[PDB]
Design a protein around this ligand. Sequence first.
Ligand SMILES: COc1cc(Cc2cnc(N)nc2N)cc(OC)c1OC
Ligand SMILES: COc1cc(Cc2cnc(N)nc2N)cc(OC)c1OC
Lengths: 159, 159
Amino acid sequence: MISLIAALAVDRVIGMENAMPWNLPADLAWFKRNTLNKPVIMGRHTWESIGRPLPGRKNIILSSQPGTDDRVTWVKSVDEAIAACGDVPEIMVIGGGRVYEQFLPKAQKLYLTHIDAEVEGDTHFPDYEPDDWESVFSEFHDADAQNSHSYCFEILERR
Amino acid sequence: MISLIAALAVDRVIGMENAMPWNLPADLAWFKRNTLNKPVIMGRHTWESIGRPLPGRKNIILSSQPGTDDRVTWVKSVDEAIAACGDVPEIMVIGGGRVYEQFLPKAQKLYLTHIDAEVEGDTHFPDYEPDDWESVFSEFHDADAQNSHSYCFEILERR
Ligand SMILES: COc1cc(Cc2cnc(N)nc2N)cc(OC)c1OC
Ligand SMILES: COc1cc(Cc2cnc(N)nc2N)cc(OC)c1OC
């Protein structure tokens, strides 16, 4: 099935700028934990922004432009992206905003990190209509030495 | 013992403006649940802002000015406020920022609502040094019909 995994600042803002509120080591450990040994689909900006292949995962870049790295798979369509995942229990869509948009209607599961931090972004995680989605897990953490804002992991399943 | 209970927007902003992010019915049910059959200490602005006595609780207003309502107790000092609570298991300090400030060093427990909402306030909940405080409970809720932002209840105990 298709899952989206995303880090949200307040007002559901997202961004892939390296250091920021998107550098939270705890968010990156949670990302790693929930994507290892799964295919990841990402848009080109998310690929540029991570700037290396994610090891232990098949990396699929959805882009209208031709590929510039042979260590990952490049595709032009959401159907091509899905087909390149093969027969697997779970496909992980890892951003950015355009990619989240085109995969949400097909997704059955959301892994969200609510980061208790203010960013101006103008680029938002898409509108998951609460009537369509059931929260099944949440886990709050305080700010600590490594993690300079509080955050909350949430998993939602589609009804 | 002395507890603080407070609603925080991002950056630990607080405010007592009626409708706002401080109108969250769920935050008000949680406030009621955790303060019923306890004394409440508040500053004058919090008293003006609530604009009625809280029933089922002894209401103590800490103010340098003389009292203007006989249904509540008025005092001039934190010691006077504490003494007017009598022998009770738990004293609840309900704001505002000046009152939170002068009671934090004496508090052993914090009831915080983290509201996932942006407000400009310039008036902040005080710095609870994470090394002094242990989170023992947290409970995330999604935005719903009644509650127009996600929120998280947290209880911390002093080490
Ligand atoms: C693995 O490294 C990164 C991964 C991501 C995507 C991402 C990060 N966190 C969460 N929860 N969901 C995601 N989709 C974003 C990044 O930039 C902030 C990364 O930089 C290290
Ligand atoms: C009982 O009514 C109110 C109470 C408060 C204080 C308050 C409200 N919520 C929380 N969690 N802590 C508090 N100290 C603040 C208020 O204004 C927003 C109230 O208006 C109804």
